[PDB]
From a paper:
Teneurins are ancient metazoan cell adhesion receptors that control brain development and neuronal wiring in higher animals. The extracellular C terminus binds the adhesion GPCR Latrophilin, forming a trans-cellular complex with synaptogenic functions. Here, we present crystal structures of Teneurin-Latrophilin complexes that reveal how the lectin and olfactomedin domains of Latrophilin bind across a spiraling beta-barrel domain of Teneurin, the YD shell. The structures revealed three signature motifs of the Teneurin fold: (1) the spiraling beta-barrel tyrosine-aspartate repeat “YD shell” domain, (2) a specialized “fibronectin plug” domain that seals off the YD shell at the N-terminal side, and (3) a beta-propeller referred to as the NCL-1, HT2A, and Lin-41 (NHL) domain.
The Olf domain is thought to contribute to the binding between Teneurin and Latrophilin (Boucard et al., 2014). Most of the buried Teneurin surface is contacted by the Lec domain, which is consistent with previous reports showing that Lec is essential and sufficient for the interaction. The total buried surface in this complex is ∼2,500 Å2. In both structures, the C-terminal Tox-GHH/TCAP domain lies ∼6 nm away from the Latrophilin binding site. FLRT is known to bind Latrophilin Olf via the concave surface of its LRR domain (Jackson et al., 2015, Lu et al., 2015). Superposition of the previously solved Lphn3-FLRT2 complex structure (Jackson et al., 2016) produces a model of how the three proteins likely interact in a ternary complex. Our structural results suggest that a ternary complex of Teneurin-Latrophilin-FLRT could form via the described 1:1 binding surfaces of Lec-Ten2 and Olf-FLRT. Superposition with the FLRT2 LRR, as found previously bound to Lphn3, gives a compact ternary model that still involves the Teneurin YD shell domain rather than other Teneurin domains. The crystallographic data explain these binding results; the NHL domain does not engage with Latrophilin directly.
Numbering used by the authors: 35 to 325, 336 to 391
The structure:
Amino acid sequence: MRRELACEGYPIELRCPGSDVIMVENANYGRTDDKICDADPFQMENVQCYLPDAFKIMSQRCNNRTQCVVVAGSDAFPDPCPGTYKYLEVQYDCVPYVFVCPGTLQKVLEPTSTHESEHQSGAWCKDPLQAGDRIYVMPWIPYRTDTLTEYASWEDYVAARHTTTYRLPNRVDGTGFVVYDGAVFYNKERTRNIVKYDLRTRIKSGETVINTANYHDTSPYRWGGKTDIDLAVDENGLWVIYATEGNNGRLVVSQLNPYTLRFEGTWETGYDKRSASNAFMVCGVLYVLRSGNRVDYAFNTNANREEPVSLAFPNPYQFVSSVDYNPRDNQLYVWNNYFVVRYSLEF
Ligand SMILES: *[C@@H]1O[C@H](CO)[C@@H](O)[C@H](O)[C@H]1NC(C)=O
Ligand SMILES: [Ca+2]
């Protein structure tokens, strides 16, 4: 994380790479060390001067912005130690697009519907970190799934006008995969491991074996078809939805770091995967499809408590391939029985 300093009276400016925005993670206005901002050795003596309130002052002015004009003076900041020279030490990070929870899910709408695709099963998702209409379409074919196609826009996909073709080094084992910061997260065929293939660099950059998780048609969805592992991205981050022997057939949702490829916890839900249609994450809350085509189960990982909220979902066809949520547009990317569809939501 980036760090910048400015003495008492001198302004501080936090710059972000081009389109990115400031995110304050640590801040203090005072003195921690004597050697910094030389003025008077008598004034430099107090090395225990702190102002914890400096966080909110910086966060209110710098966040959701590329740059911020903040002056480390007595006018904007309160003096914590009178008769001591001060400096502002700020530890921050730049984000391409920051995301916050829009609200609570109620009824799923029906707008934006695409044509009858070439294949019955597959998955499609937009990059939540990249601003634009870049569509990553991955058609699923049994025992030979291996290529992702790129499309410039909704108009570009319906007209069969593709931008590029990506030949993955491993075969895909399931439909509902996910694209995060130009990197594809997919399950390897005949294995419990997930591969991170960065399309940006066009080279493999990580692989993590998911322990106790049932792989390759062992524990897929109601229709089957190698969907043992279904990746989803929400407002919180990256999630890996699967089923273990430890939970006994039930869904095991776990948070995974997109860059370190390490786990940030493991949760247990009370809903069968063999009865489930397709699971996706929204604001850290799980939602499991049932196909009587509606979502009945929901589990809050942040609260570690479930809620059986039987809420309406648009009934498409008897064959549902993949249902994944995109937190950027707050829409549902659904591939089911050839037909590919977007869906707006109630908040
Ligand atoms: C990329 O590499 C593959 C395999 O070596 C080759 O078939 C393909 O033509 C290359 N793409 C181009 C046109 O650069
Ligand atoms: Ca899903």
